[PDB]
Write a protein that binds this ligand. Structure first.
Ligand code: PC1
Ligand code: 3PE
Ligand code: 3PE
Ligand code: 3PE
Ligand code: LMT
Ligand code: I49
Ligand code: SF4
Ligand code: SF4
Ligand code: SF4
Lengths: 176, 308, 99, 144, 376, 154, 69
């Protein structure tokens, strides 16, 4: 099924020809355009008062990464390297060894935040909810080096943001 | 005393231009469902001061010019001529009462194109000289209808004295007998000042020098709209309460100036050849026919105005 | 004197603003034929010739005071018609085209 | 109706505690609306709501004038909002931490920090692994 | 003849005002996407498609997903298909808003851009709510979609849809009958029906010239055969008719979105085949088979039977397709991306003959060129 | 005397951060989100950040998208024509460090190989709000500048 | 809201009101509280120069009535 957008024959009766002449000389359709912009002048603007007001977001939002813990404080990450394998940008670098107590843990967990595409595949791939993309999006820096996160930085992000991260996971895990 | 009077005209013009930039940004903002400047000072009231200071401490990075003399000359001519356009304006009394004030403004406005031409020479760039010549062609073309339209209106007024336009409109605005002329006049002023939808210099295409060209151009915008108000929306003058004239006259000028912003927000831009056709093939034929009509009309109605 | 004072002030102030614009503490220690259409030349010449006819028309507000109104109106309309005729000539001769 | 509009304007001066408090929020936040106080965090940020405003303007924060020893009277920052209120302010949830407080953990930061880029507390990356290859150390005594 | 000299480098020959030759120099956004994809698993390569026509993100995702599903010999579940058509048409609204209003803004009409980008912002919220990203959602995947719609999303899509046609009307009030807009677009860039076909045009570049062709009708995919809508057809093959077709396509997109909301079925959102689509997280953490399959899908990825396919959809800018070659492993052997703008921009020189410099801006606008897909 | 120099720094710093006129290289995806920063919801113009400025009246270059080797010389030329003071904001992973095309033969691995960078906005793309946060962070950086204080102490 | 555009409009309006107000009041100050005489034609200039002589103080705006007859 199709329709024509612009297949119409103007009427040539004198009343219609004069209607088009008045439009040409009196600029009526240009005046009509002025009315539309005028009506906007008196509409409430859509602007919000950032940073005192924030654009709405959902619990699924993919922001700054963080490494999480169990309630006891033990790290959730077990150095399985599934995040590193799936990472589309190879932004994750991991090294691991047995911890002093024999636990399977990482000794390096880096995310190059300037390679990362913030795709969330790492947190999908993680079997223990260790690596997540948190809700923070306000972490711009003055130097490139500050965006090369190591494990200490990522653990600190998890301790900094866990209160919000846990609630967001609580609201969305039944969709996963 | 006269020196005080000159300064009480020059300085308020520069401040009016500075805050026109704020008003344009905020008026355009609200027609675009946004706010425009509202952080730098309350309701953006310090935004023009911030812009002015910023522009004047910016690096005056000019690449080598063809000629230093014309590089300085172009903005001096632009700003000097712009301030000169204001001295015969009756508001209700003029700084200088000229018997031929209307002819004086036409003469001074015809020199404004030199600043454009000299900028092209001083740019030391082939491509910038072509843009300057395209701008000159647009300007002089629309000078033709502005002159003829003004002549037609003066045939109902009787003289080149600007203050006589006040007397002519004591009973009635000239927009009523001359709304066909006012229409073409108003569009011609937009094309004359390179205002949208005629802002082809910007479409086709620093520091203090840039700020000075900008100030001169925005002073011309306000002045053209003051002249439109005087020419077509005559304010009644009470000699014992001149401030009443000034209040009403100013309001009309602000609304006319704000309509320039309104029109900018509403329309796309003309193609260069299409605005040349708008004048040579549309405005000029009507302007010539209406000039003939307005020569004949006072005679056939026995409505010739007094010569003084 | 008043007008000369006005003109001097306007252009003197313009000169001052332009020079202070060019000067400020920066705190730093370290002839031929343009490839341009003949049409644009023809716009300028056309403007010039029309501008000369507008000069002849400017006296019209004063001329309307004459007692020889019959002659005045005939010559006023004559000048405008011939101005219209030259516009018609340019138009038909493709002189107002850009292609 | 114009008169009613003006009285609403005047009620904003009183709703903000007088002329000085009205001017403080006008110059600090460029906004003089009066909303319902939803709560306050330990850093002094105040959180407001007005559900008659359109979505996005119905919740806002008036930042504290001092946080972690930093004068923030004029220098406010979106990173100053602690995570518990971050969820509410961005409309990731409906109810504030005063109504549904976050689950407490011993390792969670008790003191929120804002963006520290450009200060002596900025993050500096480094390798977290130990040296891999151990060099042979020659004997201290002579014997050639 | 004076010679002048995403981002584009146009080398033009002008005789006065007339364009005598137009030689686009592209590659300023060439990022070797097709080579990069050869080092990725099929899932790992999906986010590259968001970044091609980066205004029509989930339509690129759909094209890639359909191609992989074809080689896999599987099909996504019906609810995933309805979501994919729903967000395909929302994406067409996102593209057409960008195409029309930036086309308008480029020639001086700057105000519609601001009104309609508040609408774009609200549609960015729909992407963020299903996927957590405002743009590069990576939401549509081989096998279906990543996650089910959150509760309350469809209600908000209804609220947005209920008011949108009025926004289109306000746009038309500003442009459709404006004599300046018509002067800039009518009889500009006329392309004949036979030239459009031989030059490899697609989409509105074809329909503007009267050719009755739309892949959603002639070669339907997902559940497009189950929704009703009209194909706008031009009569003059110029910029103004292509502008009208795009505006009318936005109206038909709202028409399709209305049916998708009402006809959304229940059920799962990705194919119930854990050798292709990963199991649910709860299953991954309880069932041995599910954990194995989760482990292998997120490391090696699924293997795709050897073969080649050219698969195309009706993307907002025209026919968008992939020639995808599988060698039997879990990484594609070759992925050629057919961008509709590649052929369209190749015809700028033909379209701009006999026009003036300022018309070249209009013709580039009517083609709808994003250099992410042109350069890849 | 040092009191005078401190207040002139405040004045010129206030003027420069209150009137930031950006030039955007809309190279790719990230250009879309800067358009949304100009759009009504965030309205960058309300901060004094004009929507579009010519390179020669610009104060800050925003590199919004992937910088290829073919484009890198053109970007450097535009930076070299910016009047001073001038700042560079790198927006998005591609401009920050190459991002998803980091290992490509045709991509510059971060625009900081070509120009100096003042602010790095992370994200692929950063949200319009994240970009606005970076712009406001650049304003605070300008507020810290002490050009006259240091000049007076040479 | 749109009425936040008014403060900038008010400032510009005040700026454009000063020239007309200043000129009118400076004229009254300089012409004995009256309108400045307009002399566009030689006849009006001749009377203005005659007024200067009659005034007795060399100011054309100082008027002499029947008291001087
Ligand atoms: C020529 C004279 C022009 C004087 C300009 C004075 C501008 C007023 C001003 O600085 O704003 C107050 C500013 C406003 O503070 P602000 O610029 O930091 O902004 C804070 C408010 N928000 C968060 C909304 C941006 O105060 C200062 O920042 C201190 C610097 C004072 C600079 C003037 C020195 C005199
Ligand atoms: C008793 C008998 C008495 C005898 C005298 C009778 C005289 C009355 C009859 C004469 C009426 C004529 C009206 C004169 C106005 C000029 C008309 C005109 O020129 O319109 C044509 C022009 C081009 O029109 P176009 O569609 O391109 O086609 C024509 C060429 N093919 O169209 C244009 O000019 C378009 C302009 C484009 C710019 C648009 C921006 C302005 C829009 C808002 C303007 C609002 C009006 C301002 C009012 C003045 C304010 C002071
Ligand atoms: C470019 C720079 C600006 C150019 C300035 C050119 C000045 C032209 C002004 C002429 C306007 C005019 O005629 O009136 C001004 C005044 C006479 O006023 P007017 O009312 O017409 O006659 C007197 C009483 N009937 O005329 C006078 O006051 C006489 C001034 C004589 C000196 C003029 C020197 C001009 C030199 C410009 C170079
Ligand atoms: C009232 C009753 C009399 C009605 C007279 C109507 C005659 C109109 C003549 C005409 O139709 O000419 C139009 C045409 C120019 O238009 P164009 O578009 O170039 O031609 C078709 C190709 N597209 O042909 C042309 O070349 C235009 C005609 C030449 C230009 C004459 C201009 C008129 C003179 C201007 C002043 C107006 C009259 C005196 C004042
Ligand atoms: C409207 C009245 C305003 C009155 C305000 C008076 C304040 C006077 C103090 C001016 C301080 C200017 O500060 C200085 O400005 C110039 C503008 O090019 C900048 O630029 C200058 O330094 C840079 C290097 O640093 C050079 O490459 C450049 O060629 C030079 O112009 C400086 O980087 C900035 O430090
Ligand atoms: N054109 C606008 N309306 N503003 C704008 N976007 N740029 C111009 C801003 C400007 C220029 C010169 C001066 I002096 C001042 Cl005070 C302000
Ligand atoms: S978000 Fe995507 S690109 Fe970034 S680290 Fe995780 S998997 Fe890699
Ligand atoms: S973060 Fe998760 S997926 Fe990555 S290595 Fe640790 S446990 Fe494995
Ligand atoms: S950083 Fe992300 S959104 Fe920006 S250009 Fe690169 S791929 Fe596109």
């Amino acid at each position: 099924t199709y329709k024509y957008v612009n297949l119409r024959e103007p009427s040539m009766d004198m009343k219609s020809v004069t209607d088009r002449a008045a439009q040409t000389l009196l600029w009526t359709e240009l005046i009509r355009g002025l009315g539309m912009t005028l009506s906007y002048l008196f509409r409430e603007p859509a602007t919000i008062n950032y940073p005192f007001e924030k654009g709405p977001l959902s619990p699924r939002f993919r922001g700054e990464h963080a490494l999480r813990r169990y309630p006891s404080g033990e790290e959730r990450c077990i150095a399985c390297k599934l995040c590193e394998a799936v990472c589309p940008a190879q932004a994750i670098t991991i090294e691991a060894e047995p911890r002093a107590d024999g636990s399977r843990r990482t000794t390096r967990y880096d995310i190059d935040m300037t390679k990362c595409i913030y795709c969330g595949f790492c947190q999908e791939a993680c079997p223990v909810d260790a690596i997540v993309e948190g809700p923070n999006f306000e972490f711009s820096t003055e130097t490139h080096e500050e965006l090369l996160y190591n494990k200490e930085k990522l653990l600190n992000n998890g301790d900094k943001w866990e209160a919000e991260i846990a609630a967001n996971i609580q609201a969305d895990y039944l969709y996963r | 005393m006269f020196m005080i009077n000159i300064l009480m005209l020059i300085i308020p013009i520069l401040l009016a231009v500075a805050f026109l930039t704020l008003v344009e940004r905020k008026v355009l903002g609200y027609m675009q469902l946004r706010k425009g400047p509202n952080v730098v000072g309350p309701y953006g009231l310090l935004q023009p001061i911030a812009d002015a200071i910023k522009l004047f401490i910016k690096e005056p990075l000019r690449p080598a010019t063809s000629s230093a003399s014309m590089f300085i000359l172009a903005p001096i001519m632009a700003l000097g001529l712009a301030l000169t356009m204001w001295i015969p304006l009756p508001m209700p009394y003029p700084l200088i009462n000229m018997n031929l004030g209307v002819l004086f403004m036409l003469a001074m406005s015809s020199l404004a194109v030199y600043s454009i031409l000299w900028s092209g020479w001083a740019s030391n760039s082939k491509y910038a000289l072509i843009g300057a010549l395209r701008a000159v062609a647009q300007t002089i073309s629309y000078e033709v209808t502005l002159a003829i339209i003004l002549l037609s209106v003066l045939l109902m007024s009787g003289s080149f004295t600007l203050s006589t336009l006040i007397t002519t409109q004591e009973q009635m605005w000239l927009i009523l007998p001359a709304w066909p002329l006012a229409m073409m006049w108003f569009i011609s002023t937009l094309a004359e000042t390179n205002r949208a939808p005629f802002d082809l210099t910007e479409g086709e295409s620093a520091a203090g020098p840039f700020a000075l060209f900008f100030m001169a151009e925005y002073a011309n915008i306000i002045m053209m709209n003051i002249f439109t108000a005087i020419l077509f929306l005559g304010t009644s003058h009470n000699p014992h309460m001149p401030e009443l004239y000034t209040i009403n006259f100013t309001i009309k000028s602000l609304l006319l100036t704000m309509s320039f912003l309104w029109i900018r927000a509403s329309y796309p831009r003309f193609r260069y050849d299409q605005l040349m056709h708008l004048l040579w093939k549309n405005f000029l034929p009507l302007t010539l026919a209406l000039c003939m009509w307005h020569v004949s009309l006072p005679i056939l109605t026995s409505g010739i105005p007094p010569q003084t | 004197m008043n007008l000369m004072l006005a003109l001097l002030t306007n252009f003197t102030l313009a000169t001052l603003l332009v020079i202070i614009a060019f000067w400020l503490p920066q705190l730093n220690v370290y002839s031929a034929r343009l490839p341009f259409s003949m049409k644009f030349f023809l716009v300028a010449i056309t403007f010039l010739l029309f501008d000369l006819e507008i000069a002849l028309l400017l006296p019209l507000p004063w001329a309307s005071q004459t007692a020889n109104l019959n002659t005045m109106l005939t010559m006023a309309l004559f000048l405008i018609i011939l101005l219209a005729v030259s516009l018609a000539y340019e138009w038909t001769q493709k002189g107002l085209e850009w292609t | 109706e114009l008169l009613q509009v003006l009285k609403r304007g005047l009620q904003q001066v009183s709703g903000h505690g007088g002329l000085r408090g009205y001017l403080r929020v006008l110059f600090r936040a460029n906004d003089v609306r009066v909303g319902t106080l939803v709560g306050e965090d330990k850093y002094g940020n105040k959180y407001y709501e007005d559900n008659k405003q359109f979505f996005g303007r119905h919740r806002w924060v008036i930042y504290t004038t001092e946080m972690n020893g930093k004068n923030t009277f004029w220098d406010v920052d979106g990173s100053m909002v602690p995570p518990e209120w971050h969820r509410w302010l961005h409309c990731m949830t409906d109810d504030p931490p005063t109504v549904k407080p976050p689950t407490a953990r011993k390792f969670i930061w008790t003191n929120h920090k804002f963006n520290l880029s450009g200060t002596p507390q900025q993050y500096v990356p480094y390798s977290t692994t130990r040296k891999k290859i151990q060099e042979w150390v020659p004997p201290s005594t002579p014997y050639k | 003849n004076l010679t002048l000299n995403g981002v584009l480098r146009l080398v033009m020959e002008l005789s006065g005002e007339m364009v005598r030759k137009c030689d686009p120099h592209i590659g300023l956004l060439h990022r070797g996407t097709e080579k990069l994809i050869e080092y990725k698993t099929y899932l790992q390569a999906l986010p590259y498609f968001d970044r091609l026509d980066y205004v029509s993100m989930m339509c690129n995702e759909q094209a890639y997903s359909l191609a992989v599903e074809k080689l896999l010999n599987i099909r996504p579940p019906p609810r995933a298909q309805w979501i994919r058509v729903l967000f395909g048409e929302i994406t067409r609204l996102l593209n057409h808003i960008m195409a029309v209003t930036t086309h308008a803004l480029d020639i001086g009409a700057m105000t519609p851009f601001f009104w309609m980008f508040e609408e774009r912002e609200k549609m960015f919220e729909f992407y963020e709510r299903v996927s957590g990203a405002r743009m590069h959602a990576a939401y549509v995947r081989p096998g279906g979609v990543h996650q089910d719609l959150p509760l309350g999303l469809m209600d908000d899509i209804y609220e947005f849809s209920k008011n949108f046609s009025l926004r289109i009307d306000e746009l038309e009030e500003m442009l459709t009958n404006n004599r300046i807009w018509r002067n800039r677009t009518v009889d500009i860039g006329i392309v004949t029906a036979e030239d459009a076909l031989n030059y490899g045009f697609s989409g509105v570049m074809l329909r503007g010239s009267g050719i009755q062709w739309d892949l959603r009708k002639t070669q339907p995919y997902d559940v497009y055969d189950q929704v009703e809508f009209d194909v706008p057809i031009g009569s003059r093959g110029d910029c103004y008719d292509r502008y009208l077709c795009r505006v009318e396509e936005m109206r038909q997109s709202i028409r399709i979105i209305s049916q998708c909301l009402n006809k959304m079925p229940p059920g799962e959102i990705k194919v119930d085949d854990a050798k292709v689509s990963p199991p649910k997280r709860a299953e991954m953490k309880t069932s041995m088979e599910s954990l194995i399959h989760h482990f292998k899908l997120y490391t090696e990825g699924y293997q795709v039977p050897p073969g080649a396919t050219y698969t195309a959809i009706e993307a907002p800018k025209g026919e968008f397709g992939v020639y995808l070659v599988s060698d039997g492993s879990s990484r594609p052997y070759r992925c050629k991306i057919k961008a509709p703008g590649f052929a369209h921009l190749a015809g700028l020189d033909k379209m701009s003959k006999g026009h003036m410099l300022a018309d070249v801006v209009a013709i580039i606008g009517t083609q709808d060129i994003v250099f992410g897909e042109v350069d890849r | 005397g040092e009191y005078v120099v401190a207040k002139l720094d405040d004045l010129i710093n206030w003027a420069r951060r209150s009137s930031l006129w950006p030039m955007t290289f809309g190279l790719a995806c990230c250009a879309v989100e800067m358009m949304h920063m100009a759009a009504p919801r965030y309205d960058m113009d309300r901060f004094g950040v004009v929507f579009r400025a010519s390179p020669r009246q610009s104060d800050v270059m925003i590199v919004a998208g992937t910088l290829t080797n073919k484009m890198a010389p053109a970007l450097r030329k535009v930076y070299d024509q910016m009047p001073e003071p001038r700042y560079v904001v790198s927006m998005g992973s591609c401009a920050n460090g190459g991002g998803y095309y980091h290992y490509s033969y045709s991509v510059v691995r971060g625009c900081d190989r070509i120009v100096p960078v003042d602010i790095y906005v992370p994200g692929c793309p950063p949200t319009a709000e994240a970009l606005l946060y970076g712009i406001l962070q650049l304003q605070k950086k300008i507020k810290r500048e002490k050009r006259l204080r240091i000049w007076y102490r040479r | 809201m749109w009425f936040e555009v008014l403060p900038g409009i008010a400032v510009m309006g005040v700026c454009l009101f000063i020239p007309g107000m200043a000129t009118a009041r400076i004229h009254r100050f300089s012409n004995g509280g009256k309108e400045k005489r307009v002399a566009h034609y030689p006849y009006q200039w001749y009377l203005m120069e005659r007024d200067r002589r009659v005034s007795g103080v060399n100011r054309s705006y100082v008027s002499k009535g029947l008291e001087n007859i």
